[PDB]
Each structure stands twice: as C-alpha cells, then as structure tokens.
Paper text:
To confer the favorable attributes of ABEs upon a CBE, we envisioned transforming [name] into an enzyme capable of robust cytidine deamination and subsequently generated an improved class of CBEs that uses [name] instead of a naturally occurring cytidine deaminase. Here we describe the development of two families of base editors, CABE-Ts and CBE-Ts, which use variants of [name] to catalyze the deamination of cytosines with either retention (CABE-Ts) or loss (CBE-Ts) of adenine deamination. To illuminate how amino acid substitutions identified from directed evolution affect TADAC’s substrate tolerance, we determined crystal structures of [name]*8.20 from ABE8.20-m13, the template used to evolve CABE-T1, and TADAC-1 variants from CABE-T1 reported here. Through X-ray crystallography, we show how the accumulation of substitutions impacts the shape of the active site cavity and may contribute to the accommodation of cytosine as substrate and the subsequent shift in specificity toward C-to-U deamination.
Crystal structures of [name]*8.20 and TADAC-1.17 were determined in a complex with [name] substrate containing the adenine transition-state analog 2-deoxy-8-azanebularine (d8Az). These two structures are highly similar, and the four TADAC-1.17 substitutions (T17A, A48G, S82T and A142E) derived from evolution do not drastically alter substrate tolerance by changing the protein structure or the [name] binding mode.
Author numbering:
A (entry chain A): 6 to 156
B (entry chain B): 3 to 156
DNA sequence: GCTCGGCTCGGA
DNA sequence: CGGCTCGGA
C-alpha cells in the first residue's frame, strides 16, 4: 500500500463529485495502512460551505474512531487544502497530508500561505506533494475550463 | 426594517455558548444574522458528535446554507463569542460573508489578527471585516472557568 | 452555432 | 488539579 495506491482510491471518490456537478476533489483518511474515512466535494448539492472532500473524510474518521482527534493519521486528497480544510487537520492532529496538484492561487499548504507549518500553532502536520499530480490536474482543468499547463 | 446593535446579537450568541458549556464542550456560541434576521445558530459540539469541525461558527454557517439554499452567504454578519480559528475563518471566506463580530481574542492561536490574519490576507478572493470587544467581559467568564484560568488572560 | 468568460466557478 | 486560551489545551 504505497502513496500512489491510496491516491488511486481518492481519485475514485473525486469522480463521484465530478458526476454531482461539484469540484472534482476526493479525499481518503488512512490510519496504519487502513481506510477510516472517505470524502468528496458536495458543497453545491448539499448547500454546505464546508462540504469539501477533506472535511467529509475527517467527519467520517471521527465517527468510526469515536474521537474527533485522529492522531498519526494520513489523509490522501487530490487538491491542495484550503484555509478551512487545513485548519481541520490542526484540530484533528493528523500526521501527514498527501495532495496531488497545488492550488497556486489560494493554496494554504505552502502556496499562498502555510498554516500547517506555522511556528505559533500547537501542532505541525507534514506535507507531501506531487503524488499522482498528473491525474489530479486533469480533473480540475476540465472543471474550471483551464489548460493542464497552469498546474 | 428594525436595526439591532452588535451587543444585542452578541447577547444571543452568549445564550448558545451556555448550551455548549452544559454539554461539557468549549463555551463558544455563534449566531448568523442577515438583514437583522437570524438564519443560523451554533455552539461547540466537537466532543459530543466526535466531529473535528463541530465548532460554534461552523455549525452556524451550516444552518445558514440550509435556510438560504446556497453555500454562499453574501452581506451576512456572524456573531461569535470567541476569536475564530484557522478552520472557522477559512469557512467564512468560502461562504463570502460580510463581517465577523467576535468577543474575546485568542492570543495564542487566533486567526483574526492574533497569530495570523486570514480575513485580511492579500491575494484572497474575499475580505471580511472584523469587529471585536463586543461583550468581551461576559464571553471571557465562560472560557475562564472552562480552561480553569483567571480573568487576567483575556 | 465558429469549442463561453477568464482563467484554479460564474461574486472561480 | 496541571499549567495556562483541553489534559497531546
Ligand atoms: Zn478545502
Ligand atoms: Zn474555530
């Protein structure tokens, strides 16, 4: 079970959000090489500003583990987390975040800002990028009607 | 057409903050107002629901999106009893609200001018105004007994 | 109709 | 009660 193996599962959930006319982003929560949470974007269909892929995966992980704090967990998302999504990882105290393509415009994981690696914060989450970034950019490109070169 | 003040809506957010205090949670309350009309209510429910996103401001934003049938809430004002965190402040940018009114400041991990300022960060698509110091004396009394701290920290 | 506008939902 | 803004604050 490599990072690309778990990313292939997150890409499957991202296709479900694409069929629901949402942002094609998928997220899966892994703890000790096992899935504990799944999530995909459902903001437009559910009228929820927090119905992102990573939030729904974090919401599901807290229910199965019966604890809103998920220590030493690794989340596999297809997009760079936003300020809202990155803030939930600090509250969940997860271990590592693996995203594919970077949001060079409003990214909160080292692009526009870096809240996951802030010194004044109480928790530090490691970041790993470039995992299956070719297949993650192809979905977001057709959604925003953008070329694959901006990624 | 009646216009209420910031302290009037803050007194309602203090009522919801007592509900989170009774649920053994962080005594924080939040209420969403649009054109002097309540569209969302929220208090901390992270421990009871096992939800890392069950904060006071998030649950109030989830209620506003359901009543308005739109995850974007323009020209809306949120009345919270605590300084919003990085997660809550990021949700306000996604909801495109107009103004956030909080009571006491989180001098440690505040995201509304303390540790960071994401509502007034350059390069973002939306800018939300912040109003502070509204009924901060009564908001600190609830969080003080929760964290077992004196009133001199806030 | 002649691959929408300007670009990381349509207040991107 | 510990030590500070849940108990890994
Ligand atoms: Zn996000
Ligand atoms: Zn918060």
């Amino acid at each position: 079970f490599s990072h690309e193996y778990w990313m292939r599962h997150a890409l499957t959930l991202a296709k479900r959000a694409r069929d629901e006319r949402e942002v094609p982003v998928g997220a899966v929560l892994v703890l000790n090489n096992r899935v504990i949470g799944e999530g995909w974007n459902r903001a437009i269909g559910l009228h929820d500003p927090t119905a992102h892929a990573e939030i729904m995966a974090l919401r599901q992980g807290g229910l199965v583990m019966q604890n809103y704090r998920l220590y030493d967990a690794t989340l596999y998302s297809t997009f760079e987390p936003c300020v809202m999504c990155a803030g939930a990882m600090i509250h969940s105290r997860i271990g590592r975040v693996v995203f594919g393509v970077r949001n060079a415009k409003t990214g909160a994981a080292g692009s526009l800002m870096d809240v996951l690696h802030h010194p004044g914060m109480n928790h530090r989450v490691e970041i790993t990028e470039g995992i299956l970034a070719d297949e993650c950019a192809a979905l977001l490109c057709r959604f925003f009607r953008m070329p694959r070169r901006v990624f």
